[PDB]
Ligand binder design. Sequence first.
Ligand SMILES: CC(C)=CCC/C(C)=C(\F)COP(=O)(O)OP(=O)(O)O
Ligand SMILES: CC(C)=CCC/C(C)=C(\F)COP(=O)(O)OP(=O)(O)O
Ligand SMILES: [Mg+2]
Ligand SMILES: [Mg+2]
Ligand SMILES: [Mg+2]
Ligand SMILES: [Mg+2]
Lengths: 311, 311
Amino acid sequence: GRAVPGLYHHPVPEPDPVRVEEVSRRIKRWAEDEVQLYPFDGFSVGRYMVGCHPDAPTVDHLMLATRLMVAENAVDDSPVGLGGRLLLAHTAIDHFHSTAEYTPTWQASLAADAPRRAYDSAMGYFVRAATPSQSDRYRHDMARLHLGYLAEGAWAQTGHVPEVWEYLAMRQFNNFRPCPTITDTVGGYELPADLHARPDMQRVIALAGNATTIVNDLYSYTKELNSPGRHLNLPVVIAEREQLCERDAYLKAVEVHNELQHSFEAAAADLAEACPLPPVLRFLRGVAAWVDGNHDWHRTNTYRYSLPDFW
Amino acid sequence: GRAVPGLYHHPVPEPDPVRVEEVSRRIKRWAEDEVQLYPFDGFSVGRYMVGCHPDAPTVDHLMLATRLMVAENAVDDSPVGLGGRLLLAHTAIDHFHSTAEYTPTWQASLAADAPRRAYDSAMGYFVRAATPSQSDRYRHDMARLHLGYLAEGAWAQTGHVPEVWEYLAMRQFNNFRPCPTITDTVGGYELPADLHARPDMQRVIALAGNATTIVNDLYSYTKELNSPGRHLNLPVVIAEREQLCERDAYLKAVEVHNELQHSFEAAAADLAEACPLPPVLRFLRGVAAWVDGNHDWHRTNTYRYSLPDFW
Ligand SMILES: CC(C)=CCC/C(C)=C(\F)COP(=O)(O)OP(=O)(O)O
Ligand SMILES: CC(C)=CCC/C(C)=C(\F)COP(=O)(O)OP(=O)(O)O
Ligand SMILES: [Mg+2]
Ligand SMILES: [Mg+2]
Ligand SMILES: [Mg+2]
Ligand SMILES: [Mg+2]
């Protein structure tokens, strides 16, 4: 249950057990009764989402994020035909438009497997609740994610080890980013689209996702040593390119995380000063909350993750 | 110089020769002196862009679209590592954010090849001219395009022939769409982001891109018979799945185009009535103009394209 030594992070309060438990039961019923996601603890994802969205006004708001997070996972369920699989699944998020003949056939494919059932349903709820701007913004962040996956899968098909910055670029896209960027939707307000689009806000979001995603590299490092092949993460890539020992490579990855997290904070503090509108200040706080909550989930989840003996 | 018989389209005026010629010279200088795009007629792309953007206030506005269209092409210059290549090129469009150590190395990669030089420069000009909303919107349409490419490349690696609707879904993404959706930027006004994001506007745009992209399937069909392997387009896919003769499959593809184009028009007429704001009405007209101009460019370009003897 201990943090990575030297990892810069913020502790968080225990997540409201009443909420965790309610999310768990509703998420189990959705998975089983609505989308037949299998022929998985609700508790894991409930602690995750309650911890990451402390400002959600209701469990209904929390369930917007929870179903999308679970659907994200159903999709990870060779890489050779990945680009075709992911494109079709993307249509459950950004709909196909076609003729009266071909539309119904696409429509049937949305029931065809767990990942597409999961997405069609989870997105369905999101689109009813969110503004059209918040929906479009999510589709863009999902198109990023799928691109990230496809870079990673392309490298895996040849065992290619990218340069460190190249791995970092992939991991900018193959990245938690679609989760914190729905903080406004889940918080019951809107960050206006013209403000989301500012270059400074875009930089704040990218840094945040980049830091909180390297958190996962650091906590899941030991588990990934057993993944098929040579599964890439920042320590592994640093070690291989910068020809360092595993230990020093990992410690450097911790320092990289720290600089990304510190830069995220400085960038958010600056935007808060430059543009102190309420929906901006709340969004910035919710992104930091999602980030702190994501570190806490990784830290406490000793079922999935464990630490290397480098200290 | 003849249209596909039975293809529903709108004729267009001859493109202003003064403008075509000016675009050609400036685009040749950009390619040669700014981005070293080779160690290509300016005239082809000039007729293309003047024809597609009759409302551009200046050649500077036209050159925003022209450099992006040319950069798009430099990128098409096995599919196995495609997802890694395209991700890195995407960073020239949607920037990498990283540490003081890794940022400069990424920064150097932007000069490394023609495609990334082309994008970094072309996007550079776009970002200075457009609103932050118009920039974000372009990055999303480019992330769509790259996903489309990667589906197509994944299928090509196994010679997979998708179902027709599946091919159509890919071709929704691997699609001209980033070109007409910058019509406002090129026209010197803005479609507001909240209005762009409406589901009805999203459907109008998708149909338009879907029709004008099947135009390219129909005009480039004969050329593609010679592409390495079995290059997919709508007639080829219809023939193979619906086991039809090449001719009848092509004629059906013409009917599919016609229904997409008619549906695009009905959908735009409806939105124009539901929401008759000026920036909406102008954007709708500019999308139709881009679509009509794209058909005319395909029709007149007998250097790249020619027709099957099916009539
Ligand atoms: C948008 C969502 C929900 C997830 C984004 C994808 C990411 C970053 C992960 F799944 C975590 O990395 P990884 O794939 O290495 O996961 P594990 O280490 O836990 O297996
Ligand atoms: C955004 C831009 C500029 C282009 C989108 C990609 C598309 C649809 C094409 F290049 C045309 O199809 P295709 O690849 O079959 O081109 P050709 O038939 O002319 O070789
Ligand atoms: Mg993964
Ligand atoms: Mg991991
Ligand atoms: Mg192509
Ligand atoms: Mg073609």
